[PDB]
Amino acid sequence: RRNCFPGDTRILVQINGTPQRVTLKELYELFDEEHYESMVYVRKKPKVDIKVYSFNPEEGKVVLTDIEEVIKAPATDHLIRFELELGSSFETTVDHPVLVYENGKFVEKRAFEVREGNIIIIIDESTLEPLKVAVKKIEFIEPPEDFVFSLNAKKYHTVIINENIVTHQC
Amino acid sequence: RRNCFPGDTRILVQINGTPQRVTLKELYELFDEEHYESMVYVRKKPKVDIKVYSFNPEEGKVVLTDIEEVIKAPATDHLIRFELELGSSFETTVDHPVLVYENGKFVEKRAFEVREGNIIIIIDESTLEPLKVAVKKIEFIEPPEDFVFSLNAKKYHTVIINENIVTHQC
Amino acid sequence: RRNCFPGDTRILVQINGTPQRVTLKELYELFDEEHYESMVYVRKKPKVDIKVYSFNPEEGKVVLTDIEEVIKAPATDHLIRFELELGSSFETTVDHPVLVYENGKFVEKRAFEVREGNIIIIIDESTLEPLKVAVKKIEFIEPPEDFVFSLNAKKYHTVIINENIVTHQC
Amino acid sequence: RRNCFPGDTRILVQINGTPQRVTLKELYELFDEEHYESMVYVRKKPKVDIKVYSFNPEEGKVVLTDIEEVIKAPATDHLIRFELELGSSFETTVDHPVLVYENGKFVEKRAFEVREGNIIIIIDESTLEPLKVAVKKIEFIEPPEDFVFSLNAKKYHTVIINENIVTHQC
Amino acid sequence: RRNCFPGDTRILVQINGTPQRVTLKELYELFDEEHYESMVYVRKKPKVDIKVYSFNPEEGKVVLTDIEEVIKAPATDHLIRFELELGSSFETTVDHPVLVYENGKFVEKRAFEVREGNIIIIIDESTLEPLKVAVKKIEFIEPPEDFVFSLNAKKYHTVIINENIVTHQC
Amino acid sequence: RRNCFPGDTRILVQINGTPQRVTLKELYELFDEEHYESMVYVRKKPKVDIKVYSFNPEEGKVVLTDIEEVIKAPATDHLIRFELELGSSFETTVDHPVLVYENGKFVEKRAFEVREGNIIIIIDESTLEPLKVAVKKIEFIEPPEDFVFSLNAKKYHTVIINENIVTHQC
């Protein structure tokens, strides 16, 4: 019954009697009592009357089933996020080279080595001039698009995405 | 000078004197004389006066350089696309199980084994009833989001994405 | 009790009282009631009195045991098969370049892009002249040599291949 | 011009004026002056007048070209070969368990740990009795079927296999 | 409860009432009744009163628990060890080139092909002269530093390494 | 001429006329003019008269050659280092669970989510009591043992490690 879905995939459920299509990230945020088990986040208690629409291939009938667990698997690796002055942002890999101004020179610096206060070269969208801006904040971030969600349901483990009956999206 | 970019990444160029931001898929479709070399598609002749904006870190100056080649690398694996009756579509992996109606039974069939004329079970978005629809067309497709583009430029190999000076997006 | 065997590996069994060596592909085709479960084909009902010869290392005795399931795992990726005129065939990878004649030119075309009616260049075995033949049929095929079989037996999970007692061939 | 071929693949060449189809293992054994360079065996001097048949797609003509190097890449990992008494052989992986008789017990022993003089249990093909045989010889062997060959030719790098014009078999 | 630890990692246990820090290799060698199961060595019977110190996060208390199994996983691949004359040793990979003297020539030979009696070139640490020494012994060895150990404990599966409460070291 | 060596591997060189064995990390720190090129750190200017001892297999003679570049390749992934109060340290993977005290509860927290000021549970080596200590510092660190060094030398690319003539240690 193990499956993988992107965060933005919409599946069809019944909450408080009415049916609708919720994104799997929303379905996760519709549970609580989070627990970091193994290498994933498991949520087992719902805070709204939840049921997932599945299919019974023995009787060939659309059916309701219980959402036992909702699972959120963090990204494998993470990116580095430089919040710079003048509002500009820069997300990149830890090994990607960043153009830095130091000691009157333009040098290529491994993103992992950039520190707050360092000068990044950016290029103004209006004037197309090289601008010297400072790194205000450095954050190791996991892009929501890199998360993998799973759904453990009782008995009937298939899920209804748009019009289709899908088992997983690994 | 080898790099990787998604198809939808916008880089800044000068065409016929004016500068603007074009997607790398557009930049590819702005060349011609295609050639399948090694395992990639190379386009070397431009049909519009093209130059890419890069950066000179010796003088610290934004500069124009020539786009020698634009490269398009096909997806690794491909998906199967079922065009069904009533307008519905279904894209999936060759090994994903598809709910099929055959011999009065609902069976799980490997997508690779589905044939035209087979009956797929779908679920109507309005009525939530199981519908029996027929496979009209079967296509092995490569999603545009799975293509990897590259840019070979002369001397200065960096590229200006929004405000940032990036080397690649591998 | 999970194992892997090529299709052509011969193991020793007793069918209808007599013992003999059957290939694992034959052993699979000696069952029925196929089911595509997970990502493999499982056959659980035998159509002939079947037992597999295994070994009891506690008493050190050759023994008979029941064949619960026979499993067939499809190839990972598949090849493209071009059936050409004049009887010639061509099996290759989806990314391998095929010599095509189009618009009076010999071009290298990604096998994935070849279509029925396209002209392939072949070389006659007798005369060694380049011949222009047409693609009559295009098939995505899985070579039997790429399939991986498994055997689930009761209690004693080893198998007798020629003279040897082997556990698997992963 | 880098390619990969199995040892048993037949390509078409001209030796001493006459054309014929030789296996790539034979083509390798038709050269000498072996050299272990990088992680492969290179042979550069031919001991017979050799030329390989290739294709000129500019003029669309079958052509002769020079075989600069023939390359033989050893298998990645190797197997263990037990030569046992009574003529029986056993090839397996270093981690596969071998049924051994020691101290009056049948034990599963990692193939890597088996030594000469150890007792292997085999099963006679005629009588189907368990036989105790001794390991006479232990050899770390590389199966010929696991070798990967390459051909470096001048200018025209394609090769004629049966009727087809193929670039590689990676 | 599955974990991985290097051989030299020290965990804290109580043997015969007194607590101390033992290396996981020592902890393995403190059990017996070895069994090669799957692809690992399992030891289940202790020859000394053993208990492992774990943590109870419900009561937040350091606790004793039973060591059910201790597991030792062999290295993936192995090295070749040349015992040479004059006491010198040489450990290397099966594919690494070894400088050999044969037929009055210095040749690079694949380590896998070196045989006993072959002449290796070494360089004396005192005089810095090239010395011709003979291969006396050839051994396929698994470096202790390449082994991966595991601990199966009852209920509480965490382990106390120095001052820290760690789950694994995969 | 591309090779890989651990940081602690000692190779034999001549500095200012005298020969000795320096670790490759020391050899790197004996150069300067660092440059982050591709995904590695290259040092090309020596600050001490350097030459590396290599071997000439044509004349069979130990020889001196020039060290063109010394290369340092950063670790693939990095660890998280928690500097805690009372002097204790904790290095772990970003996904490893850390025992945290929050809201009067002992919870398992993904190391990536631990913040400064959080309470870690450790276990005193003397008293074996659980101690509540605070995270003072959080550092993303690359262990020196995870770095891979390379040496580009002129003509003769082999290196003398102890008594042996080795090409690489990939």
Numbering used by the authors:
A (entry chain A), B (entry chain A), C (entry chain A), D (entry chain A), E (entry chain A), F (entry chain A): -3 to -1, 1 to 167
Paper text:
Protein splicing is a post-translational process by which an intein catalyzes its own excision from flanking polypeptides, or exteins, concomitant with extein ligation. Many inteins have nested homing endonuclease domains that facilitate their propagation into intein-less alleles, whereas other inteins lack the homing endonuclease (HEN) and are called mini-inteins. The mini-intein that interrupts the DNA PolII of Pyrococcus horikoshii has a linker region in place of the HEN domain that is shorter than the linker in a closely related intein from Pyrococcus abyssi. The P. horikoshii PolII intein requires a higher temperature for catalytic activity and is more stable to digestion by the thermostable protease thermolysin, suggesting that it is more rigid than the P. abyssi intein.
Instead, we resorted to single anomalous diffraction with selenomethionine-derivatized Pho PolII intein. Surprisingly, solution of the crystallography data revealed that the Pho PolII intein precursor was present in the crystal as a domain swapped dimer. The intein structure we observed consisted of monomers opened between the two symmetry-related units, with the N- and C-termini of the inteins on the same lobe of the monomer. Residues Arg-3 to Pro71 and Phe144 to Cys + 1 are in one lobe of the monomer and residues Leu 76 to Ile138 are on the other lobe. The active site of the domain swapped dimer is compromised, making it unlikely that this conformation of the intein is catalytically competent. The thiols of Cys1 and Cys + 1 are 3.4 Å apart in the Pho PolII structure, suggesting that there could be a disulfide bond present in each monomer, as we observe experimentally and in the Pab PolII monomer. The peptide bond linking Asn-1 and Cys1 is in the fully trans configuration with a dihedral angle of 177.1°, indicating no strain in this scissile bond for the Pho PolII intein, which has been suggested as a potential means for altering the equilibrium position between the amide and thioester in step 1 of splicing. However, the orientation of the Pab PolII intein with respect to the monomer segment is slightly altered between the two alignments. This suggests that each lobe of the monomer is generally folded as it would be in a typical HINT domain, but the two lobes do not combine properly to make an active unit. However, in the case of the Pho PolII structure, iPAS is very unlikely to occur, given that there are two passages between each domain such that the N- and C-termini of the HINT unit comes from the same monomer. Instead, it seems more likely that there is an equilibrium in solution between a properly folded monomer and the domain swapped dimer, with a folded version of the Pho PolII intein with the typical HINT domain as the active species.
